[PDB]
Amino acid sequence: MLQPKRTKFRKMHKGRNRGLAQGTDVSFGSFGLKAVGRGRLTARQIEAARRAMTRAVKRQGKIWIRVFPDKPITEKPLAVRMGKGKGNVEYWVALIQPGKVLYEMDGVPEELAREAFKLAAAKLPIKTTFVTKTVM
Amino acid sequence: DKKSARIRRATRARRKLQELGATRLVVHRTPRHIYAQVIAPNGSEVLVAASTVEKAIAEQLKYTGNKDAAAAVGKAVAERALEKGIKDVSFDRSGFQYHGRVQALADAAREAGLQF
Amino acid sequence: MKKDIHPKYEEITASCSCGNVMKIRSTVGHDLNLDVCSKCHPFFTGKQRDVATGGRVDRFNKRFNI
């Protein structure tokens, strides 16, 4: 499970998740899993889709993870009234805009990357798509 | 290095006279020569100037970089300033110590009639 | 230099066992008689000689004859 080792601050505002993404092009590898929807991916969802494509490739090829969960998410416990401070940090998310490349992959064929990224996208709440390395 | 530290050493009183609007006598000192010039409060144009590089001053002297040359320079620039009607200035040491040739120049200009 | 804070630094004569008479400025005051100077120090002959490894086979053949 991905998590920052150190943080400048322990808690963070809820913020918003509007705007387009930046990690749009397939930078490192040959095939990519691009986000189409909007939302937040936890560290569990990231690690589960990583497991599903590492097992689908039999550790063949190289897999990049373009995102990193750096936003802390607080929750208040059950049967706690709405005052008395901000809730306790429970888990970590990464804010995902449309166009964000989530994963990259090479060293494998295209059809194997399709079935691996499909097994990974079945572990993700947001709608994804398959992309390849574009020249320019 | 030495040039830069002299400029850093001079640029406080220069900016202070820059905001005082002071007509300022600028001394510049070399081991061989000594220079003087009276500068308008805008800092962009001069009024009078004197040196030991001028022939009319250097030919009456033994060496161009001693105290007697520096006093002859401060006398010449003061007599030119009083010729042009400039009487009250402010002495810019230009990062040198007020000592030796610089002091003998300013004492010559005080004695010849400038007021600072 | 300043005037008073420094020790006395006066020219004296230092002669050596090799007869190297040398006048130097020093804080000793009295005259000096040396033992070795840089002229007569065995840096150029003696330290070269003073390694002296010697041979083991040559020691063996030295100790007798067949």
Partner: protein, 81 residues
């Protein structure tokens, strides 16, 4: 299930800093132009710097903001009026 607190309740009063008279704005002598902590601005012609780096007018006239110096620092001067 009662409990909690908040070690983080504090804050100080707003000091009402900023620029009191903007550019092209005629002032009297002694009029406060800028209150500020550091020298975010600097005093130019006919402008004094206070004890707390407050920029006040030494004369009467219009405020002129301008950028001078090798460091591109922001100077405030009073134009004549």
């Amino acid at each position: 299930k009662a409990g909690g607190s908040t070690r983080n309740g504090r804050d100080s009063e707003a000091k009402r800093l900023g620029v009191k008279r903007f550019g092209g704005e005629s002032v009297l002598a002694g009029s406060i132009i800028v209150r500020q902590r550091g020298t975010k601005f600097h005093a130019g012609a006919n402008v004094g710097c206070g004890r707390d780096h407050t920029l006040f007018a030494k004369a009467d006239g219009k405020v002129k903001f301008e950028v001078k110096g090798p460091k591109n620092r922001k100077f405030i001067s009073i134009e004549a009026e």
